[PDB]
Paper text:
Immunoglobulin E (IgE) is a central regulatory and triggering molecule of allergic immune responses. IgE’s interaction with CD23 modulates both IgE production and functional activities.CD23 is a noncanonical immunoglobulin receptor, unrelated to receptors of other antibody isotypes. Human CD23 is a calcium‐dependent (C‐type) lectin‐like domain that has apparently lost its carbohydrate‐binding capability. The calcium‐binding site classically required for carbohydrate binding in C‐type lectins is absent in human CD23 but is present in the murine molecule.
To determine whether the absence of this calcium‐binding site affects the structure and function of human CD23, CD23 mutant proteins with increasingly “murine‐like” sequences were generated. This study offers insights into the evolutionary differences between murine and human CD23 and some of the functional differences between CD23 in different species.
Author numbering: 158 to 251, 255 to 292
Write the structure that this text describes.
């Protein structure tokens, strides 16, 4: 009936859980690190979710789960969803910079995928209160 339960070290927002990771990672590195924790690099689909992420975002930049896929020819989230909501920094995005990071402001920019960032965000679904 109510789905806000999250694992230790994760934080709940709405029906999801979020992990604010710290450590030096390239984009595909953060992707696999989230997968190792049974999550995914975060996907962002509303201003309310973004505002939550901004409150907890690292000041020096974080990888998020968005990258430009060559065959589809567009930015696609790690879970296969399309970009409906976006929070690009003004002028962004602008060949080579295929991966997407989130600044301390919450705003996004594209970047070389081998850039090393000190933070990254995973998400997963929250679990739910049981039957009595």
């Amino acid at each position: 009936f109510v789905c806000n339960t999250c694992p230790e070290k994760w934080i709940n927002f709405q029906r999801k859980c979020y992990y604010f990771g710290k450590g030096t990672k390239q984009w595909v590195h953060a992707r696999y690190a989230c997968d190792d924790m049974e999550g995914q690099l975060v996907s962002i689909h509303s201003p309310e979710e973004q505002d939550f992420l901004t409150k907890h975002a690292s000041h020096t930049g974080s990888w998020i789960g968005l990258r430009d896929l060559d065959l589809e020819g567009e930015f696609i989230w790690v879970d296969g969803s399309h970009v409906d909501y976006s929070n690009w920094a003004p002028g962004e995005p602008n060949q080579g910079e295929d991966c997407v990071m989130m600044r301390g402001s919450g705003r996004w920019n594209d970047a070389f995928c081998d850039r090393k960032l000190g933070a990254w965000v995973c998400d997963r679904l929250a679990t739910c209160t049981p039957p009595a």
